[PDB]
Design a protein around this ligand. Structure first.
Ligand SMILES: CCCCCCCCCO[C@@H]1O[C@H](CO)[C@@H](O)[C@H](O)[C@H]1O
Ligand SMILES: *C(=O)C[C@@H](NC(=O)Oc1ccccc1)c1ccccc1
Ligand SMILES: [Cl-]
Ligand SMILES: [Cl-]
Length: 178
């Protein structure tokens, strides 16, 4: 079963998403979003908490599905610390790129997922002995989501997703060295 990081992240995302139903998107964004005024630049959770917000049912459902599967695999085979670091860095870098290109009003686990699939894929592609790999059907399911978001077929930006992917590829690369 899904490890503690995999589990606690899912719960947090659910709780936050409930809060957004109860209070509206904007009001929750007022507290958790990337600093959107210099008044807020020292509220440090915000460099991370933006990842916890989702705006539709499908957003949180698909994000959490991929998180549960990939994140859960990473936690189980490579440990909780690994998953924590991939998450922290991908969240920060994709958040950074996103706000740079389009301002601070955004949310979600997408950057983190791009990192996890970049990680699992490259890791297995370069080092099967690790035990982790993105099997063919999932490489296909994954690419279809990459394509979708890329050409804006679902409504959700590219640069931030690339930024997330770069983090996962970078860490898989490093991890698969000796
Ligand atoms: C024969 C082709 O094999 C496939 O090549 C892909 C890259 O082209 C890999 O990503 C995939 O996992 C692998 O099964
Ligand atoms: C974030 O990108 C939202 C997006 N989630 C998604 O694309 O997840 C994946 C899956 C596989 C590889 C990369 C990213 C999304 C779009 C539309 C509906 C739900 C979620
Ligand atoms: Cl398969
Ligand atoms: Cl490792």
């Amino acid at each position: 079963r899904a490890g503690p990081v995999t589990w606690v992240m899912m719960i947090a995302c659910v709780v936050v998403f409930i809060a957004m139903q109860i209070l509206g998107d904007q009001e929750v964004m007022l507290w958790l979003a990337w600093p959107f005024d210099p008044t807020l630049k020292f509220e440090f959770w915000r460099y991370f908490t933006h990842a916890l917000m989702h705006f539709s049912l499908m957003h949180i459902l698909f994000n959490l599905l991929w998180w549960w599967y990939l994140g859960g695999a990473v936690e189980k085979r490579l440990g909780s610390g690994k998953l924590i670091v991939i998450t922290l860095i991908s969240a920060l870098l994709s958040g950074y790129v996103q706000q740079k290109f389009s301002g601070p009003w955004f949310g979600g686990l997408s950057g983190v997922v791009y990192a996890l699939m970049g990680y699992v894929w490259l890791r297995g592609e370069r080092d099967p002995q690790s035990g982790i790999y993105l099997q063919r059907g999932l490489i296909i399911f994954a690419l279809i989501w990459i394509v979708a978001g890329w050409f804006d077929l679902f409504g959700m930006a590219n640069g931030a997703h690339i930024a997330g992917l770069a983090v996962g590829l970078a860490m898989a690369f490093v991890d698969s060295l000796n």
